[PDB]
Design a binder for this molecule. Structure first.
Ligand code: GTR
Ligand code: NA
Ligand code: NA
Ligand code: NA
Ligand code: NA
Ligand code: NA
Ligand code: NA
Ligand code: NA
Ligand code: NA
Length: 859
């Protein structure tokens, strides 16, 4: 009934192509004969030309269909086109196709990472064990993932871990380094042997990613060092262990690629370069040299928390075959019109003429609801080509990265909804448009009508309503985040909401340059719009009141769309009901958000004109916002375990996610309610007493601290020299700080060596640390969660006293707090000029010393 002939040299990938073509033929009637009436010839060439990689031709000639694969991936993707054409038409006549993928690497990532740190381990550190990661040892579950990967014609799988080597390689010189028992090493060995075998037959490259500088805890416990400390120098020993470990990994897993992050535990770009050129690359060559390999297989290097151009500039004489990675829209998905300074980084990395991989990273602003908008994804990949000059793709899970393999969805009696079931369209869209981006958009709505229809057992025409829900709801998180968001970072969980404070005083919640300038069409923040209204300047670009208008029409339409289609389902009906609850969530969130912003404008108008009417107007709008948030909670309280999957104190917006708190809509309603109580109390006091609450400014009393590493003390007051190497003393100093006992360091010595403070305290203290506001690189940069997970370990992420210190012929400084228990402490501050102004047991009150900001009405 149907012959399937396989021609030439076997190879695992030709076999697999045949295995898959057989399955689908039988799976639809049709009897078969395999070999070397109606025939399909699978032909495979040897073709070196880097031009025809992953390419296939399909022609037909009477009763005989021919698939030419220019290489192993090519024949696989040839057989995929037959199968898809079969899946979409009745028939077994085949439309001729001559085709190759546009993007040369197309791939996705699984974090061997957890929602929370692990006792005795720092951020990103999770040994490969069945205790932490049962799912990693499940072969049934790997074949399901890999088949989804091949079906979407993705050719790369990236495993993300802080320090994977201690789980996978033994070193004679460091045999105590090992982070797993003997039985767990054997299973790691079996599971990588099986992963790479099974990925290979499917044309999938397996890529192990690691951060730096991180060592094993046993390695650390023995030598007396930490597993990781961002600002600690490179040492021969840590270097020797990392080098031998990579040499080992290469020898043992010759077909597994490496994705290097030169972060987040390396303090300067120079140390970033020393590490890659003197430790990693020498290590990769040790392995190649043992394997007797003349060639240089590609090594992948991220832009994250390094100077991408500096590091490739430095490395290419040592190793030709570098590929680069950079985030698409930072740690979120905001636009298909990215631009500005982040575009240029992409574009310089891209203008090497190698591979440059767009990382759709973390999707903080999508967590945790269903998101898979064909149109948004198509337009995005097109921007990757035209703006960013990317020619490859790496994609995170749509949501719940940190909790693989499960979505955050709450099912009856503790059943966990799985991520490969829920987010199929996500993987299928990125995969589709990575293969070919320019596809007739109307032709595309038919294909997606049938994809959503097949899955729910609905006709395509009725299923078009499912596509609208996805494309209408899909614009909401991106628009709100680029236009009102504090950060593209997972330091923010957009879909829990924002306080009025964060709408009327965004700069107080720290907004790094490059976010608003890159992750959307230009346009005004709410404070800029309102400042423009009161000063009668014209408005330029994308405006906040337009967006909230767009965003509630997105909500209304997505709801009207899914509500038509939801009871038609012959299949996955329970899932379709969770999609409908999701769209009602996005609608109530949109309306909550709309009314809140509207109220914020009204409080900003009070800021500029001091009309009381303005504040009165805000109350009804805050009530209505709260109504819609109360409606959100009913929908979420029985359908979601949480929103954010990073459930640590690295989550700062809308508030701390310390110890896993403040990770549900229910918890947030408690704080949003309090918000309005305070507001209506503050209004009432204005209307009786005509007084507001403002900071009372009192000196911080000096803690009873002893210093263990013989620092020089200085009193902090106008004139004190906190730098020994400049003649300039202090010429401005916040009243809070004067009196305190701080330290004198050599700024030159701080560039080369940093700043170790070693002290004991008999009750809890805050150390006050001055970071100078100056792009000159001689200055230590302030802590920054976006680049550095440990930047809130002492509660130092955001500053307490801004514009609080000036030294003559240096700069202005913000004061940051480093909070410590009673105990004995060592801490290395970033290389560069910086101040240490002393220690207080006292409560610290946030103040902009320059100044009364519009957001005391909420406190
Ligand atoms: O890019 C990275 O690896 C990191 O980026 C940080 O900003 C984020 O908070 C981390 O959880 C991690 O995703
Ligand atoms: Na057909
Ligand atoms: Na351990
Ligand atoms: Na990246
Ligand atoms: Na809830
Ligand atoms: Na925490
Ligand atoms: Na002392
Ligand atoms: Na000056
Ligand atoms: Na402590």
């Amino acid at each position: 009934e149907v012959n399937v002939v396989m021609t030439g040299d076997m190879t695992t990938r030709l076999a697999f192509a045949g295995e898959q073509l057989k399955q689908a033929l039988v799976e639809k009637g049709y009897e078969v004969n395999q070999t070397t009436k109606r025939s399909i010839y699978l032909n495979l060439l040897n073709d070196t030309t880097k031009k025809n990689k992953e390419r296939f031709d399909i022609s037909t000639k009477g009763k005989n269909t021919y698939v030419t694969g220019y290489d192993g991936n090519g024949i696989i993707y040839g057989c995929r086109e037959l199968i898809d054409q079969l899946d979409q038409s009745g028939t077994m006549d085949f439309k001729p196709v001559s085709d190759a993928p546009e993007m040369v690497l197309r791939g996705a990532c699984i974090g061997l990472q957890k929602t929370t740190y692990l006792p005795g381990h720092a951020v990103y550190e999770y040994p490969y064990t069945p205790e932490s990661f049962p799912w990693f040892y499940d072969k049934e579950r790997w074949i399901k993932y890999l088949d989804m990967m091949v079906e979407n014609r993705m050719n790369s799988l990236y495993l993300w871990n802080g320090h994977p080597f201690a789980s996978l390689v033994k070193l004679k010189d460091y045999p105590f380094a090992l982070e797993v028992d003997e039985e767990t090493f054997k299973k790691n060995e079996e599971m990588f042997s099986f992963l790479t075998t099974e990925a290979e037959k499917r044309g999938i490259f397996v890529i192990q990613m690691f951060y730096n500088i991180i060592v094993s805890k046993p390695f650390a416990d023995h030598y007396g060092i930490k597993t990781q400390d961002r600002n600690r120098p490179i040492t021969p020993l840590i270097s020797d262990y990392t080098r031998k470990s990579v040499a080992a990994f290469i020898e043992k897993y010759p077909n597994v690629g490496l994705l290097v992050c030169l972060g987040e535990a390396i303090g300067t770009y120079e140390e970033d370069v020393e590490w890659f050129t003197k430790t990693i690359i020498p290590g990769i060559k040790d392995g190649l040299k043992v394997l007797g390999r003349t060639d240089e297989p590609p090594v992948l290097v991220r832009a994250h928390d390094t100077d991408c151009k500096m590091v490739i500039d430095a490395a290419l004489p040592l190793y030709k075959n570098l590929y680069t990675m950079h985030k698409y829209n930072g740690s979120s998905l905001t636009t298909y019109e990215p631009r500005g300074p982040w575009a240029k980084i992409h574009k310089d990395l891209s203008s090497l003429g190698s591979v440059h991989i767009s990382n759709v990273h973390i999707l903080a602003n999508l967590e945790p609801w269903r998101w898979s908008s064909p149109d948004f994804i198509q337009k995005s990949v097109k921007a990757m080509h035209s703006v960013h000059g990317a020619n490859a793709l790496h994609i995170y899970p749509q949501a719940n990265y940190w909790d693989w393999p499960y979505t955050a969805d709450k099912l009856a009696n503790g059943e966990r909804e799985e991520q490969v079931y829920r987010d199929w369209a996500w993987y299928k869209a990125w995969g589709r448009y990575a293969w070919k981006a320019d596809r007739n958009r109307l032709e595309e709505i038919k294909y997606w009508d049938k994809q959503f229809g097949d899955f729910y057992g609905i006709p395509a025409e009725m299923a078009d309503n499912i596509r609208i829900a996805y494309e209408e709801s899909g614009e909401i998180a991106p628009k709100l985040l680029r236009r009102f968001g504090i950060t593209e970072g997972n330091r923010q969980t957009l879909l829990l909401g924002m306080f009025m404070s964060q709408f009327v005083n965004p700069y107080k919640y720290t907004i790094h340059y490059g976010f608003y300038e890159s992750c959307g069409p230009g346009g005004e923040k709410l404070i800029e719009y309102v400042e423009k209204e009161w000063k009668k300047q014209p408005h330029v670009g994308e405006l906040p009141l337009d967006i909230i208008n767009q965003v509630i029409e997105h909500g209304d339409k997505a709801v009207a769309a899914i509500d038509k289609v939801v009871s038609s389902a012959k299949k996955n009906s329970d899932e379709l009901r969770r999609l409908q609850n999701d769209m009602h969530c996005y609608r109530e969130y949109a309306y909550a958000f709309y009314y809140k912003v509207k109220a914020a404008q009204h409080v900003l108008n009070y800021h500029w004109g001091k009309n009381m009417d303005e504040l009165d107007k805000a109350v009804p709008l805050m009530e209505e916002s709260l109504k819609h948030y109360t409606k959100l909670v009913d929908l979420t309280k029985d359908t979601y375990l949480f929103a954010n999957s990073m459930q640590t104190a690295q989550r700062r917006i809308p508030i701390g996610g310390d110890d896993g708190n403040n990770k549900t809509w229910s918890e947030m309603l408690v704080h949003y309610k309090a918000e309005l109580y305070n507001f209506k109390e503050n209004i009432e006091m204005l209307k009786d007493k005509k007084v507001r609450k403002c900071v009372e400014v009192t000196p911080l009393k000096e803690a009873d601290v002893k210093i263990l590493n013989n620092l020089t003390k200085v009193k902090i007051e106008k004139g004190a020299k906190i730098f020994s190497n400049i003649d300039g003393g202090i010429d401005a100093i916040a009243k809070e700080i004067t009196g305190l006992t701080g330290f004198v360091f050599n700024g030159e010595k701080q560039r080369d060596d940093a700043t170790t403070i070693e002290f004991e305290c008999s009750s809890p203290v805050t150390m006050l640390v001055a970071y100078f506001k100056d792009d000159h690189r001689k200055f230590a940069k302030a802590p920054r969660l976006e680049s550095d997970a440990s930047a809130n370990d002492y509660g130092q992420a955001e500053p307490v006293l801004t514009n609080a210190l000036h030294v003559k012929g240096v700069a202005l400084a913000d004061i940051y707090p480093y909070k410590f228990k009673a105990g004995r402490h060592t801490l290395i501050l970033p290389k560069g000029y910086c101040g240490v102004l002393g220690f207080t047991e006292d409560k610290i009150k946030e103040r902009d010393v320059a100044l009364d900001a519009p957001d005391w009405l909420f406190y």
